[PDB]
Design an enzyme around this catalytic site. Structure first.
Site, PDB file in Angstrom:
ATOM      1  N   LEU A 133       1.235  -1.473  -0.132  1.00  0.00           N
ATOM      2  CA  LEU A 133      -0.145   0.022  -0.153  1.00  0.00           C
ATOM      3  C   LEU A 133       1.073   0.852   0.312  1.00  0.00           C
ATOM      4  O   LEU A 133       0.805   2.401  -0.595  1.00  0.00           O
ATOM      5  CB  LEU A 133      -1.000   0.113   1.366  1.00  0.00           C
ATOM      6  CG  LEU A 133      -1.549  -1.556   1.485  1.00  0.00           C
ATOM      7  CD1 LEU A 133      -3.377  -0.896   2.278  1.00  0.00           C
ATOM      8  CD2 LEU A 133      -3.365  -0.624  -0.281  1.00  0.00           C
ATOM      9  N   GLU A 190       5.395   2.490   0.846  1.00  0.00           N
ATOM     10  CA  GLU A 190       7.469   2.087   1.660  1.00  0.00           C
ATOM     11  C   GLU A 190       7.202   3.769   1.152  1.00  0.00           C
ATOM     12  O   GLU A 190       6.856   4.190   0.927  1.00  0.00           O
ATOM     13  CB  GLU A 190       7.442   1.137  -0.044  1.00  0.00           C
ATOM     14  CG  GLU A 190       7.427  -0.125  -0.790  1.00  0.00           C
ATOM     15  CD  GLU A 190       8.405  -0.250  -1.861  1.00  0.00           C
ATOM     16  OE1 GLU A 190       9.684  -0.288  -1.603  1.00  0.00           O
ATOM     17  OE2 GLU A 190       7.352  -0.593  -2.309  1.00  0.00           O
ATOM     18  N   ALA A 232      10.641   5.148   4.438  1.00  0.00           N
ATOM     19  CA  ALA A 232      11.179   5.802   5.906  1.00  0.00           C
ATOM     20  C   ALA A 232      10.399   5.828   6.823  1.00  0.00           C
ATOM     21  O   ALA A 232      10.353   6.849   6.984  1.00  0.00           O
ATOM     22  CB  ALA A 232      12.595   6.574   5.786  1.00  0.00           C
ATOM     23  N   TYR A 233      10.368   4.878   7.541  1.00  0.00           N
ATOM     24  CA  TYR A 233      11.820   3.424   7.534  1.00  0.00           C
ATOM     25  C   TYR A 233      10.274   2.469   7.922  1.00  0.00           C
ATOM     26  O   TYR A 233      10.280   1.362   8.920  1.00  0.00           O
ATOM     27  CB  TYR A 233      12.688   3.569   9.228  1.00  0.00           C
ATOM     28  N   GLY A 234      10.164   1.789   6.502  1.00  0.00           N
ATOM     29  CA  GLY A 234       9.553   0.273   6.335  1.00  0.00           C
ATOM     30  C   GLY A 234       8.660   0.540   5.488  1.00  0.00           C
ATOM     31  O   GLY A 234       8.437   1.978   4.757  1.00  0.00           O
ATOM     32  N   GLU A 235       7.668  -0.549   5.290  1.00  0.00           N
ATOM     33  CA  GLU A 235       6.410  -0.139   4.405  1.00  0.00           C
ATOM     34  C   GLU A 235       4.781  -0.600   5.480  1.00  0.00           C
ATOM     35  O   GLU A 235       5.169  -1.055   6.115  1.00  0.00           O
ATOM     36  CB  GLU A 235       6.574  -1.662   2.992  1.00  0.00           C
ATOM     37  N   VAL A 236       4.265  -0.527   4.181  1.00  0.00           N
ATOM     38  CA  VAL A 236       2.587  -0.584   4.147  1.00  0.00           C
ATOM     39  C   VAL A 236       1.790  -1.620   3.560  1.00  0.00           C
ATOM     40  O   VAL A 236       1.933  -1.291   2.310  1.00  0.00           O
ATOM     41  CB  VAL A 236       1.611   1.043   4.605  1.00  0.00           C
ATOM     42  CG1 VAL A 236       0.641   0.477   5.322  1.00  0.00           C
ATOM     43  CG2 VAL A 236       2.200   1.999   5.729  1.00  0.00           C
ATOM     44  N   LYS A 283       1.675  -1.965   9.286  1.00  0.00           N
ATOM     45  CA  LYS A 283       2.392  -1.304   9.234  1.00  0.00           C
ATOM     46  C   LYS A 283       4.141  -2.223   9.863  1.00  0.00           C
ATOM     47  O   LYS A 283       4.253  -2.266  10.753  1.00  0.00           O
ATOM     48  CB  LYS A 283       2.477   0.618   9.727  1.00  0.00           C
ATOM     49  CG  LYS A 283       3.611   1.319   9.262  1.00  0.00           C
ATOM     50  CD  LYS A 283       2.879   2.642  10.009  1.00  0.00           C
ATOM     51  CE  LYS A 283       4.641   3.520  10.554  1.00  0.00           C
ATOM     52  NZ  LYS A 283       3.673   4.228  10.439  1.00  0.00           N
ATOM     53  N   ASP A 319       2.002  16.674  11.366  1.00  0.00           N
ATOM     54  CA  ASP A 319       2.727  16.541  10.169  1.00  0.00           C
ATOM     55  C   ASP A 319       1.255  16.239   9.509  1.00  0.00           C
ATOM     56  O   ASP A 319       1.559  15.255   8.551  1.00  0.00           O
ATOM     57  CB  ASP A 319       3.282  14.807   9.845  1.00  0.00           C
ATOM     58  CG  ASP A 319       3.892  15.714   8.325  1.00  0.00           C
ATOM     59  OD1 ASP A 319       4.426  16.596   7.820  1.00  0.00           O
ATOM     60  OD2 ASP A 319       4.828  13.737   7.945  1.00  0.00           O
TER      61      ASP A 319
HETATM   62  C1  LIG Z   1       2.531   5.639   6.751  1.00  0.00           C
HETATM   63  O1  LIG Z   1       0.818   4.623   7.258  1.00  0.00           O
HETATM   64  C2  LIG Z   1       0.421   4.729   7.809  1.00  0.00           C
HETATM   65  O2  LIG Z   1       1.292   5.086   8.994  1.00  0.00           O
HETATM   66  C3  LIG Z   1      -0.570   4.150   8.201  1.00  0.00           C
HETATM   67  C4  LIG Z   1      -2.216   3.861   8.484  1.00  0.00           C
HETATM   68  C5  LIG Z   1      -3.466   3.294   7.816  1.00  0.00           C
HETATM   69  C6  LIG Z   1      -2.554   3.208   6.858  1.00  0.00           C
HETATM   70  C7  LIG Z   1      -2.647   2.803   5.144  1.00  0.00           C
HETATM   71  N1  LIG Z   1      -4.353   2.036   5.370  1.00  0.00           N
HETATM   72  N2  LIG Z   1      -5.176   1.717   3.770  1.00  0.00           N
HETATM   73  C8  LIG Z   1      -4.372   2.330   3.772  1.00  0.00           C
HETATM   74  C9  LIG Z   1      -2.958   2.654   4.477  1.00  0.00           C
HETATM   75  C10 LIG Z   1      -2.120   3.325   3.471  1.00  0.00           C
HETATM   76  C11 LIG Z   1      -2.499   3.101   1.917  1.00  0.00           C
HETATM   77  C12 LIG Z   1      -2.794   3.948   0.893  1.00  0.00           C
HETATM   78  C13 LIG Z   1      -2.813   3.509  -0.008  1.00  0.00           C
HETATM   79  C14 LIG Z   1      -2.234   3.995  -1.834  1.00  0.00           C
HETATM   80  N3  LIG Z   1      -2.044   2.465  -1.925  1.00  0.00           N
HETATM   81  C15 LIG Z   1      -1.360   2.320  -3.525  1.00  0.00           C
HETATM   82  C16 LIG Z   1      -1.055   1.478  -4.222  1.00  0.00           C
HETATM   83  C17 LIG Z   1      -1.441   1.101  -6.040  1.00  0.00           C
HETATM   84  C18 LIG Z   1      -0.256   2.090  -6.839  1.00  0.00           C
HETATM   85  O3  LIG Z   1       0.030   1.593  -7.261  1.00  0.00           O
HETATM   86  C19 LIG Z   1       0.127   2.467  -5.784  1.00  0.00           C
HETATM   87  C20 LIG Z   1      -0.631   3.068  -4.985  1.00  0.00           C
HETATM   88  C21 LIG Z   1      -4.129   3.183  -0.549  1.00  0.00           C
HETATM   89  C22 LIG Z   1      -4.764   2.578   0.960  1.00  0.00           C
HETATM   90  C23 LIG Z   1      -4.004   2.941   2.329  1.00  0.00           C
HETATM   91  O4  LIG Z   1      -1.253   3.431   6.576  1.00  0.00           O
END
Ligand SMILES: COC(=O)c1ccc(-c2[nH]nc3c2Cc2cc(CN[C@H]4CC[C@@H](O)CC4)ccc2-3)o1
Length: 270
Positions: free
Chosen positions: A13, A15, A17-21, A36, A121
């Protein structure tokens, strides 16, 4: 009962610093969560702050698991993705959509400030959308407690993202936490309405910032913004944090209370 604790990591979901979701799907229930993965004090504070959070416009924390030198944070999956991808470059988005997202951002920020937490942020990359396009504040990695035992602690740490940071963070040694988050919300509102950021940073050395203080609203991005949301931005993007509008007063603003958007399209027959 068996295998209910097993989750499959099906897609990346996010990528950085520092890590991936990673998107995780339960083997039995097919429930989707975001995991996370942080490759290991900063994470210990993030977990502690996340355990305090319970609000409809804040990403939910389900728990964490430590596998040696790796921490796994189990958080709310928001299928709508980031607010960032709803902003059309140099255009923005329809004013009713931005208003609705801004109301939800204010409800989330009111909640955090009410429990003495500052995000520090706020930006469209950190504002996630669920299946019904409900805004959720995410990533409490830079977050901190500014109020404890009803005593406010002044901040001095330099953090955030330069186009979204308040000018006091760059000019003053110490500053109040709450006007900092209000400013970043005004830059998010500017981004949603004009599809561009007004300056690289809020400093006198920055021409775009000097033009705003000189009220040159005939220039971009301000010329793309209607007078009612622009009058609100004139109250938020105030250099002096003591003169800057507070959220209780943002809730009384004319544009904030302007009827613009219809509710979600409900199925109907004639
Ligand atoms: C640093 O992130 C977090 O702390 C955090 C907490 C909860 C989440 C999260 N829940 N659901 C999502 C996240 C991050 C997130 C990002 C995205 C966008 N992803 C795309 C996937 C296909 C595309 O080709 C690239 C980007 C879609 C859904 C989600 O992220």
């Amino acid at each position: 009962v068996p295998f209910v604790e097993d989750w499959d990591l099906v897609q990346t979901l996010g990528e950085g610093a520092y890590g991936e979701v990673q998107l995780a799907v339960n083997r039995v229930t097919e429930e989707a969560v975001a995991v996370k993965i942080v490759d290991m004090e900063n994470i210990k504070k993030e977990i502690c702050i996340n355990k305090m959070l319970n609000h409809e416009n804040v990403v939910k924390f389900y728990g964490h698991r430590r596998e040696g030198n790796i921490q796994y944070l189990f958080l709310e999956y928001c299928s709508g993705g980031e607010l960032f991808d709803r902003i059309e470059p140099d255009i923005g988005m329809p004013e009713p959509d931005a208003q609705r997202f801004f109301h939800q951002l204010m409800a989330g920020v009111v909640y955090l400030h009410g429990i003495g937490i500052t995000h520090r942020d706020i930006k469209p990359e950190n504002l996630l959308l669920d299946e019904r396009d409900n805004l959720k504040i995410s990533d409490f990695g830079l977050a901190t407690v500014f109020r404890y035992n009803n005593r406010e602690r002044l901040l001095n740490k330099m953090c955030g993202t330069l186009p979204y940071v308040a000018p006091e963070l760059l000019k003053r040694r110490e500053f109040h936490a709450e006007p900092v988050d209000v400013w970043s919300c005004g830059i998010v509102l500017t981004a949603m309405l004009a599809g561009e950021l007004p300056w690289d940073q809020p400093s006198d050395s920055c021409q775009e910032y000097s033009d705003w203080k000189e009220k040159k609203t005939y220039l971009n991005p301000w010329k793309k913004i209607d007078s009612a949301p622009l009058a609100l931005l004139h109250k938020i993007l105030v250099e002096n944090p003591s003169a800057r509008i507070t959220i209780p007063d943002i809730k009384k603003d004319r544009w904030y209370n302007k009827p613009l958007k219809k509710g979600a399209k409900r199925p109907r027959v004639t």
